[PDB]
Write a protein that binds this ligand. Structure first.
Ligand SMILES: CN[C@@H]1CCc2c(ccc(O)c2O)[C@H]1O
Length: 281
């Protein structure tokens, strides 16, 4: 009496995720003043989020509400590979943006020489290649498959799709996709905040006659709150099988996806972007 009609809540996520990234891409591409070395990371992240909005969410919604995977097994493997690829690419692009901000702030004179039109292409291509080798190579080769009887029963039957993964693959994927970027971004942002505080003290020293905390809080909190809860259960549920149920795992995984829709609000607030949005509509 309430399961069927509540498809609007899942459809709104798809609509918002598509719309935000579409506007970001259109604003960057069509408008002359928005093209900058930093903006290429933004457009790569926007494309990665658009792939999630167009591929993984619509099929997952059907698989959940219908409780039956109508399609075959090849599409199941392909969809899982797409999911892993997009997630890791998005997180590593966030890490790349953070490191670029660190270089921009800490070394003002020599920022120009390090990043240019040439280096952005190479770094983006290497990030996407690293993301691709994590997902497609182990999943498609069938090297990640489990061993217990339940996994065999699930993988033999075509109509059932569930994620059963070996301990080593889970640990390796979690480490390569989440923790290293988290440590890098934490160190970078702490250093940047310390620099900002030092500059504020320096100016107050002579001009005698908050904002950084708020910005850092938003940037760190949205990412950590959206995804950290997932990888914790991802690592725990393989070490000891009795603890974590499947429903909790699914809920945390779907909570992680919503972070894709919040990226345009977090990373696109410049007055130039506002002018571009106003001109489009
Ligand atoms: C079913 N969805 C997948 C399952 C496991 C997994 C995800 C994302 C990144 C990873 O490194 C993973 O191992 C999830 O999005």
């Amino acid at each position: 009496v309430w399961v069927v009609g509540m498809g609007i809540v899942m459809s709104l996520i798809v609509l918002a995720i598509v719309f935000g990234n579409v506007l970001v891409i259109t604003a960057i591409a069509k408008f002359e003043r928005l093209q900058t070395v930093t903006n290429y990371f933004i457009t790569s992240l926007a494309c990665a989020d658009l792939v999630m909005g167009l591929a993984v969410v619509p099929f997952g919604a059907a698989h959940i509400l219908t409780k039956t995977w109508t399609f075959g097994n090849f599409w199941c493997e392909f969809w899982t590979s797409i999911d892993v690829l997009c997630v890791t690419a998005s997180i590593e692009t966030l890490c790349v943006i953070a490191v670029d901000r660190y270089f921009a702030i800490t070394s003002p004179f020599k920022y120009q020489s390090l990043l240019t039109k040439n280096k952005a292409r190479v770094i983006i291509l290497m990030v996407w290649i690293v993301s691709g080798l994590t997902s497609f190579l182990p999943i498609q080769m069938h090297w990640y498959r489990a061993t217990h009887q339940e996994a065999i029963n699930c993988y033999a039957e075509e109509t059932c799709c569930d994620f059963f993964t070996n301990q080593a693959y889970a640990i390796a994927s979690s480490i390569v996709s989440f923790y290293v970027p988290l440590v890098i971004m934490v160190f970078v942002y702490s250093r940047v905040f310390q620099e900002a505080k030092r500059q504020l003290q320096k100016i107050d020293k002579s001009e005698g006659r908050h904002k950084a905390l708020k910005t850092l809080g938003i940037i760190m909190g949205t990412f950590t709150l959206c995804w950290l809860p997932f990888f914790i259960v991802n690592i725990v549920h393989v070490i000891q099988d009795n603890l974590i149920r499947k429903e909790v795992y699914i809920l945390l995984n779907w909570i992680g996806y919503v972070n894709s829709g919040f990226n345009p609000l977090i990373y696109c607030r410049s007055p130039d972007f506002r002018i571009a949005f106003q001109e489009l509509l």
